[PDB]
Amino acid sequence: KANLSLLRRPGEKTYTQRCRLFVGNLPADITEDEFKRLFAKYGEPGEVFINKGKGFGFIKLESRALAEIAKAELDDTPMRGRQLRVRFATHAAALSVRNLSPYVSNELLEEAFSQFGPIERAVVIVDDRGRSTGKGIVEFASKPAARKAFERCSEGVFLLTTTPRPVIVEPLEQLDDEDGLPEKLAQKNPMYQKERETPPRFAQHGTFEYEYSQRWKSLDEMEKQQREQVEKNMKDAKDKLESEMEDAYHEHQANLL
Amino acid sequence: KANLSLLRRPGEKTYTQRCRLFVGNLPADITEDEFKRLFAKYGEPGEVFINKGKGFGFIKLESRALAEIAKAELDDTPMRGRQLRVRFATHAAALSVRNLSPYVSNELLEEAFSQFGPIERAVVIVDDRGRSTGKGIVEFASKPAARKAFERCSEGVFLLTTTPRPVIVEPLEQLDDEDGLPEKLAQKNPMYQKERETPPRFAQHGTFEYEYSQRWKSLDEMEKQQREQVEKNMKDAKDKLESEMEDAYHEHQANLL
C-alpha cells in the first residue's frame, strides 16, 4: 500500500500522457479539492484540471497501472446522482512511423527518436505471430518534440540500421473503439427517425435497394483490385530501385579493386 | 468487496473473451489450484487453462473491469523468481464492418448482427470529434457465429437503415502495440549484428544511402498519389451510381402517378 512505485513497469517514465485520465459528468458543485479526494487512494497526483460548469476534469497519476486501476474502480460510479465517466485522455504528441526494417526493435525506435526530444513511449506494432508489421508509434512528452521529429524526418533521410530504409513519419490517427457512437447521440441527427423506419435486413432480389447494393458492391470490389494493383506496381518499382542501386554500388566497388 | 457485480458495466455480458487474461512466464512447478489462488481476490473464475511445461495459462474473470484490475495488479510481479506477464488474450471471433451510414449506432450494429449468433460487443469506431468513421467492430461469443455473419453478409445484401448502404464484413486484423518488438527477440535475427553496426542517423548528401533513400521516398510519394487517385476515381463511380439509381427510382414513381 505505502510503496505505489511497485506498479511502475521497468523503464516506464512516471506521470506521462498515458497516466492521464479524463473524468466526465461530474456534479456542477464539484471543487478541485473534492476531485483530488476522489483519486487520493492512487498516490500523489500530477496535473489537476477541472471545468465546474461542463462537469469534467483531468488528472495525471504516477504510473499507467495506477491509472488503469483508478479507471476500472471509478468509472460508472455515482457521485450526487451522476454516474461518472472515466477514460484515458487522448495522446496529444503521438506519431506514426513506417518503412521499418524487420529487425528494428522498440528500444532502437526510442534511441533514434530521442534526439528530437524526450520520449514517453516508442513501440513497433507486431502481428499475431510477433513479426514486425513495418509500422510503429512514437509518443513524445511535448508537441514541439513531435513536430521536430515530423519535420526533420520529412526533410531529411532518417535511417535506423545499416540497410538504408528511410523512416516515414506521419501524425497518428487517434480513433475511439470504446464509447464509439451511442444511440443517444445518433438520435440527435435529423435523418435518424426516417432512417430507423426500415429495420436491419437482407435486401430481396427484384428491388431497387438490391440492384443498387449489388452494383455498389461490384464497384467496391473494383476499388480493392485497383488499390491492390497500385500496391503491386509500386512494390515492383521499389524492388527495381533496390536492384539498380545495388548494381551501381557493385560497379563502384569494381572501380576501386 | 462482497459484491463484485458492481464492476460490471450497464448491458455488459459476463465472462466474455474480453474478460480473458493470458499469464506467461509461470514457474514450471505451478499447479492449477495455485494458478486459481493467484486470482482468488477477483471473484469466481470462468474457464481455467494451464500448460505447466511452457509456463502459461488462461483465466476468464466476471467483468472487463475485474480483468483490467487483475492485469494491472499481477503483471510484472515475481513468482518463485519469475516475473509474471499478464495480458488480455486476443479475441478469436472478431470482425471488421465498413460502409456504415453516419447515423448507425453501437446498439443498431449489435441488434443487426445478433441474428447470426450472440454478440459480446459491437461498436462503431469514431474519430476525435465523435463522428462515425464508417467502420465498426463486431465481437461474437463463438467462431461459427462470426463465420455465418461473414458468409451471409458477403453472399447477400445486409442493410441496417432505410438508406441502402450494404455493410461490408471482413475479418479484424489483430495487431499488438503493447509488447511490440523487444530487442531480446530482434537479437535472435541473423542480420541484427550487421544491422546495428550503423547507428540511427540522417543520411548525408553525396552518398549511395542518400541517393537510394531520396529515390525510394519519391516512389512512396507516387504510391500515395496513385492510391488517392484510385479512391477519388472509385468515389466518383459510386456517386454516379447513387445518382443513376435515384433517377431510375424517380422515373419509376413517375410511371405510377
If you write DSSP's letter for every residue of A123-182 in order, what string do you get? EEEE-TTS-EEEEEEEEESSHHHHHHHHHHHHHS-EE-SSS----EEEEPP--BSSS---
Cell numbers representing residue A141 in the block = 512528452
Mutate one of B12, B216, B223 to test the A interface: name it (highest A CB count within 10 A).
Answer: B216
* Nearest residue, CB atoms, A177 vs list B65, B123, B179: B123
| DSSP type of residue B165 | -
Q: H/E element holding B213?
A: helix B208-254
- Pairing outcome for strands A78-79 and A85-88: unpaired
How many angstroms separate the CA atoms of B161 and B159, rounded?
Answer: 6
CB contact A227 to B (< 8 Å) = yes
Contact at 8 Å (CB) between A119 and A140? yes
Gap between the terminal Cα atoms of chain B? 69
The domains spanning B1-93 and B94-182 adopt the same CATH topology: yes
Query: CA A90, CA A143: separation in Å to the nearest integer?
Result: 13
Rounded Cα distance between B17 and A163, Å, is: 41
Q: How far is A1 from chain B (nearest CA, A)?
A: 12
How far is Cα A138 from Cα A169, in angstroms, rounded to an integer? 9
Question: One-letter amino acid identity for A166?
Answer: P
From the list B79, B85, B132, B78, the residue with the least C-alpha distance to B109 is B132
Q: Do A161 and B198 touch (CB under 8 A)?
A: yes
The CA distances from residue A178 to A83, A246, B63, in Å, are: 17, 48, 15
The burial class, CB within 10 Å (0-12 / 13-18 / 19+), for A10 is: exposed
Query: Could you give the CA distance from residue A122 to residue A114 in angstroms, rounded to a whole number?
Result: 10
Put simply, the answer to whether A123 touches B194 (Cβ < 8 Å) is no
Q: Does A12 touch chain B (CB under 8 A)?
A: no
CA A171 to centroid of chain Cα atoms? 9
Cβ-Cβ contacts under 8 Å, A183 against chain B? 105-108
Cell of residue A168, nine digits: 516515414
For residue B4, the number of C-alpha atoms closer than 13 Å in the C-beta half-sphere is: 17
Q: Mark yes or no for CB contact A76/B191 under 8 Å.
A: no
Calpha distance A192→A188 (Å, rounded): 8
Closest alpha carbon within chain B to A104: B186
Phi/psi for A122 (5° steps) reads -140, 130
Would you tell me how many other CB atoms lie within 10 Å of the CB of residue B21?
23
**Please, which residues bridge with residue A23 across strands?**
A57, A86
Does A226 touch chain B if contact means CB atoms closer than 8 Å?
A: yes
Rounded to whole angstroms, the Cα distance separating B55 from B25 reads 5
State whether residue A32 is helix, strand or coil: helix
Superfamily of domain A94-182 in the CATH hierarchy: RRM (RNA recognition motif) domain (3.30.70.330)
Distance, CA of B5 to CA of B36 (rounded, Å): 19
Options 3.90.78.10, 6.10.250.1170, 3.30.360.10, 2.60.40.420; which CATH number does B183-257 get? 6.10.250.1170
* Residues in B 94-153 with any Cβ partner in A closer than 8 A: 99, 101-108, 111-112, 115, 123-128, 130, 132-133, 136-137, 152
Q: Which are the contacts of A35, defined by CB distance < 8 A and separation ≥ 6?
A: A23, A26, A48, A50, A57, A59
Distance of CA B134 to the CA centre of its chain: 16
Q: Are the CB atoms for B166 and B160 separated by under 8 Å?
A: no
List, in order, residues 6 or more apart from B96 with CB less than 8 Å away. B135, B136, B137, B169, B170, B171, B172, B173
By C-alpha distance, the chain A residue nearest B244 is: A212
Residue B138 near residue B94, CB atoms below 8 Å: yes
Question: What crossing angle do the helices spanning A64-74 and B64-74 adopt, rounded to 10°?
Answer: 150
Q: Return the exposure string of A110-122: e unless at least 16 CB atoms fall within 10 Å of the residue's CB, then b.
A: bbbbbebbebbbb
Which of B232, B197, B248 lies closest to A226 in space, CA to CA? Answer: B232
Chain A interface includes B65 (CB < 8 A):
yes
User: Which chain A positions have a beta carbon within 8 Å of B219's beta carbon?
Assistant: 234, 237-238, 241
Q: Burial, A141: exposed, middle or buried (Cβ in 10 Å; 0-12, 13-18, 19+)?
A: middle
* Cα–Cα separations (whole angstroms), residue A200 to A43, A65, B140, B162, B165: 49, 41, 18, 9, 11
* CA distance linking residue A237 with residue A57, whole number of Å: 51
CA gap B200, A107 in Å, rounded: 12
Specify the residue for cell string 549511395: B208
Q: Determine contact: A198 vs chain B, CB below 8 A.
A: yes
Q: Any idea of the CA torsion for A82, B2, B68, A182, to the nearest 10 degrees?
A: -30
Domain A1-93 CATH superfamily: RRM (RNA recognition motif) domain (3.30.70.330)
DSSP state string for A71-109 = HHHHTT-EETTEE-EEEEPPPSSEEEEE---TT--HHHH
Nearest CA in chain B to A138: B177
Length in residues, chain B: 257
What lies within 8 Å, CB to CB, of A199 at 6+ separation is: none
CA distance B133 to B99: 9
Gap positions in chain B, given as the residue before each gap (C–N > 2.5 A)? none
Q: Exposed, middle or buried by CB within 10 Å (0-12, 13-18, 19+), for B18? A: buried
The domain segmentation of chain A, as residue ranges, is 1-93, 94-182, 183-257
Mutate to test the interface with B, among A91, A181, A231, A245 (most CBs of B within 10 A): A181
Residue A155 sits at the chain B interface (C-beta within 8 Å): no
CA torsion A176-A178-A180-A184 (nearest 10°) is -140
Place of cell 500522457: A17
Sole residue written with cell 490517427: A173
Contact check, Cβ <8 Å, B202/A107: no
C-alpha to C-alpha distance for A136 and B239, rounded to whole angstroms = 35
Q: At A50, which helix (H) or strand (E)?
A: strand A48-51
Contacts of A114 (CB under 8 A, 6+ apart): none
On whether the CB atoms of residues B86 and B71 are closer than 8 A, the answer is yes
Experimental method: X-ray
Contact B100, B127 (CB under 8 A): no
